[PDB]
Amino acid sequence: DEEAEQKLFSEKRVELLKELSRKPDIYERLASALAPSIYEHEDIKKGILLQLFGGTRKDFSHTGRGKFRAEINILLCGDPGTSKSQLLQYVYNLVPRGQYTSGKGSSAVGLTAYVMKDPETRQLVLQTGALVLSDNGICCIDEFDKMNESTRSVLHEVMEQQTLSIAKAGIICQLNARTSVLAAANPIESQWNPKKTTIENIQLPHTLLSRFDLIFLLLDPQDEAYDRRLAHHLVALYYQLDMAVLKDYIAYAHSTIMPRLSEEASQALIEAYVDMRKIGSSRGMVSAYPRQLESLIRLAEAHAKVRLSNKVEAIDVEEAKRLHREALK
Amino acid sequence: HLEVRDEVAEKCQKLFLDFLEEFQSSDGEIKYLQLAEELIRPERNTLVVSFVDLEQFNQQLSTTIQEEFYRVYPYLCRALKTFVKDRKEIPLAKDFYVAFQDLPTRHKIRELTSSRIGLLTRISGQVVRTHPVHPELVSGTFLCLDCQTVIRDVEQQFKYTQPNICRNPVCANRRRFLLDTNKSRFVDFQKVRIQETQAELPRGSIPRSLEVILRAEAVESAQAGDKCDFTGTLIVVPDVSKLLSYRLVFLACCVAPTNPRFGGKEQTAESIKNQMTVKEWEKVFEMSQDKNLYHNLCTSLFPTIHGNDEVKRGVLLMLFGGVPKTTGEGTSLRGDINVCIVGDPSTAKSQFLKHVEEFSPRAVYTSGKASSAAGLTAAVVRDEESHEFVIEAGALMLADNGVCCIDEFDKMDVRDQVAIHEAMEQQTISITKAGVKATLNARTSILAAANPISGHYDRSKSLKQNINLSAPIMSRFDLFFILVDECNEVTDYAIARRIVDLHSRIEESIDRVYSLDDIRRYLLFARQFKPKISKESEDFIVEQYKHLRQRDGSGVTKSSWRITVRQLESMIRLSEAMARMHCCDEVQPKHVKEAFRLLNKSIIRVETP
Amino acid sequence: SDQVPVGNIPRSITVLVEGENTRIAQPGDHVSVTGIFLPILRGLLSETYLEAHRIVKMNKSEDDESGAGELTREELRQIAEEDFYEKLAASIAPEIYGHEDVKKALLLLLVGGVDQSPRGMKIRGNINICLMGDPGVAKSQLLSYIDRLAPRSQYTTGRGSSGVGLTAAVLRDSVSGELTLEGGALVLADQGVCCIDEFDKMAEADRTAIHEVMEQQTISIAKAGILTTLNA
Ligand SMILES: [Zn+2]
């Protein structure tokens, strides 16, 4: 509601934002200020920071293609105790217009749209679920594994086309939303056994793993150094950057930025997809379909918005390619 | 003692009566004296005055209409009962209605505050329900009871209103009058409900709705599922049970579609060849005479899809349609062809469906996991107001004579794939339920997309083992396009180039001949022929059916979904749909040869290690 | 429901609290009321209500003495002893021989740790305890005892309670058609202890409704009447 209110920024503040956006690492300096209670986990905060900006909002009404999703869906898989649900509980309390759901306490129609016998007029009327009430924000879905395959095949529409087509007793309509899932699951057997293949610990289909574009595998064992550093950090919470910089940097970077691709960036995006195929084909980890080539765009542009660059260049593809590669390892 | 001159109303009535006669069109020839001509034959009682012309002829008036439209409506209709006495054949107690149109400025259902009541607005929305038509009493003629006189011309206001004073000094019943009902004045009255259009919804909100009240010859213009554009006045309505509580209601006077595909005014080759504007008709002819047309509709309909040249052709032949025939006994041959796609992940399946559903008019789009049986075909709903079970139309019905795009066709339940087969077979929809017995028509063509069992398409089995559709359904399609993503490094460059181009050229990378508006015209024209078969073409067809069966012959090879008779009745259909395309009126060998090559590439050979 | 004939239906009465006795009693509570018993105004049959003059909470089985929790110096004598922690441990369900260590932990559960909030990151300060063990080791005795030793407590059985009846349920009123919320077991036991024996026999879809209450200690409902988070 405060896009007209962005023009209501002190010009003393736009200087601050534009100058903070010039330091060589403003990316790692803002990211590392998310949730100052999680331990390092350096990449997951990068992904969850790029998710708060999202790719450009291009206008494809002319090409008859339809619309184009601009928000980023993130999946977190990894063995227990690795602080997944804490990240969801932190984001849900950060973003406005969000929801938090669970595995068994949510049904197929409760997430998208149900039809209720209105009490007074005795007529069937439509209502909105959880994935539509968010609509501008994040829909944290914890316990992603423990949802029977019925209620899981519902996300296929709302998370890829940003739409929802309902055809029931008297209601024939077509909603739409601008949500962005952030899901968390456990491997099958709840224990990451390295005997099996990556496409077997997750046990999700391919028509659902491809709608995500950042599958973070929190592969964390009993590293005697990591455990010691984490415990040393956690105990400290018992003795005893700002927000309004981030809380305003985000509003600005939403209001007055629209990164358009280049020709030098576009020429690193073609090979970055022709190699992904040969890589993901053999290993049996997670194949790559052309949809990923759009995700890179989604990621690349979303990186440019961090530094207010208004134009996508080469490095904004190498970064959001290293991010896409070094998450599954 | 005598009544008061409502001057602001009568002065406006006078100026409007003047405007009706003085205003002329481009060639003299006063225009509201010829549109008001047909206004005498029975069943016509609304004159449609454009509002922009009332702006030309006058401007001290438009600002009186657009600000008092409820005060001065009962006078802009009497000033039409005098202007039309020059015909002398109208029944003297008949009454007429003025219906404006083409207002300058629009509004939204959320801008309809309470500072707008009594003014003249304009609204756009969808249509959800439509109640039945009724009579409504506008001015009763109370036959007095004791005097046996007639109290006359008493106006009702949302109630019966029982006027209680007589002009007779001896009226024993100032509380009793039996009104007649063979002289009083009735008008039709339909009450529908509209819902906020899609492009106005503020994000994260459920759409509002309001009641509109069509009250004239305009009484069945709006139907359910349409996107009309109403123009009337907002009024308040009491709660007549206690006659308080008020509620807003829109009182429409004119209703017209929101975006006419043909801006003239809103069924054979000549009726349409009349409305063709000069450029329209000199372009349709040019296309119909074009050679290689069958390759410039594909390249111009799907401009951003590299390859699958054998799928675009099938989709086109599905859009044009075959010839629907009715056997003399009473049965009927299916006229339109159905098409299913089956392929590897990310092979542009949902892209064909999205293209078709955004191009075509009156074509609906549904997924499979989020549908129902009683939502596709037809439902039964208890309207407690009428306290009766009535029929609701489904996706296979409000897409009639169009195309129904079903995505993920094999996710639907076991019992929801049964109701769809009962419709795909007989082209009808039976209903037998609480108190309802009916048979509805459904002449849709289905375009369905599915996924092989276990992700990938295994090329060593028949079809029946690669997909989980039923057995009957797989027989009612008669065109399959199995797609296989044999990861080719040369494509993975082409697709990459095309996608990055489209994303660097937002609105460009779509330059093609025969712009999309034009193809709709050509397709509405060329879909009104009924090509016939010449004897040589019939001989060719039977020979091709001979040469198709024996390929499936024993010994040498093997194929999937064995060829049967139904493939033959589906070769004449493709040839007829091919002939329609070239605007001809007969089938030739040139068509059947190609309609056979296509159906030949459709079926693949099972393999074995 | 204890003082009812073996299988008879309990009867209700209406109480019109007004003036100063309001906001005394909470729903789902043992109480003792003193007031006139009158009929309702407006043939000869009459419906009756109790017009309360005095309301006393009798949760402790005697009379609400929570506010009278005063420790004397002669008791500070005990609390100051060297092993005060070890006297209480032995004085928990003394009818049960053995189990010297389990009673040491069932006391920590009743006292509870401390709960932090650094940089806005809540950490719970309660303790949860399970008692996996062979048959006939007096577990349903220990639990029945820890039920009576707690100000706010609840008792539930795994095989006789559904997953929506533990957390919170949305239910309709056939008089008004309006959906209202109704707390479960974990809500009614907000600042206290809940006891669930026969925990391996609870249905598997009715058991994952506890993962929320054990870590964040809220209950987030988004059914088709309500959208909220209760505190549990
Ligand atoms: Zn009289």
Author numbering:
A (entry chain 4): 433 to 672, 682 to 770
B (entry chain 6): 15 to 257, 292 to 314, 320 to 662
C (entry chain 7): 241 to 282, 291 to 480
Can you provide the manuscript's text about this entry?
We therefore decided to co-express AND-1 together with the components of the human CMG, and succeeded in purifying a 14-subunit CMG assembly which we refer to as CMGA. CryoEM analysis of CMGA using Warp for particle picking and CryoSparc for image reconstruction yielded a 6.77 Å map that was readily interpretable and permitted the unambiguous docking of the high-resolution structure of human CMG and the crystal structure of the AND-1 trimer that we reported earlier. The structure shows that the disk-shaped AND-1 trimer docks edge-on at a near perpendicular angle onto the leading face of the CMG. Despite AND-1 being full-length, only the SepB trimerisation domain of AND-1 is visible in the map, indicating that both the N-terminal WD-repeat domain and the extended C-terminal region spanning the HMG box are flexibly oriented in the trimeric structure. AND-1 binds at the perimeter of the CMG, engaging both Cdc45 and GINS with the β-propeller of one of its SepB-like domains. The CMG–AND-1 interface is formed by the B-domain of Psf2 and the helical portion of Cdc45 linking its two DHH domains, which together occupy the concave surface formed by blades 1 and 6 of the SepB β-propeller. The interface buries only 1087 Å2, a surprisingly small area for a constitutive interaction. However, we can determine that the interface is of mixed hydrophobic and hydrophilic nature, and that the tight binding of AND-1 to the CMG despite the relatively limited interface might be driven by the presence of charge-charge interactions that become solvent-excluded upon CMGA formation. AND-1 does not contact the MCM proteins and binds to the side of the CMG where Cdc45 and GINS are located. Because of the high interaction angle of the disk-like AND-1 trimer relative to the plane containing the leading edge of the CMG, the N-terminal WD repeat domains of AND-1, not visible in our structure, would be placed in the trajectory of the parental DNA.
Unwinding of parental DNA in eukaryotic cells is performed by the 11-subunit Cdc45–MCM–GINS assembly or CMG. The six MCM proteins, MCM2–7, belong to the AAA+ family of ATPases and form a hetero-hexameric ring that translocates on single-strand DNA. In the absence of DNA substrate, MCM2–7 adopts predominantly an open spiral conformation; the co-factors Cdc45 and GINS—a hetero-tetramer of Psf1–3 and Sld5—bind to the MCM5-2 interface and lock MCM2–7 into the closed-ring conformation required for robust DNA unwinding. The 11-subunit assembly of the human CMG shows the familiar architecture first demonstrated for the yeast and Drosophila CMG: a two-tiered ring of MCM2–7 proteins, with the Cdc45 and GINS coactivators bound together to the N-tier portion of MCM2, MCM5 and MCM3, so that Cdc45 faces the MCM2-5 interface of ATPase domains.
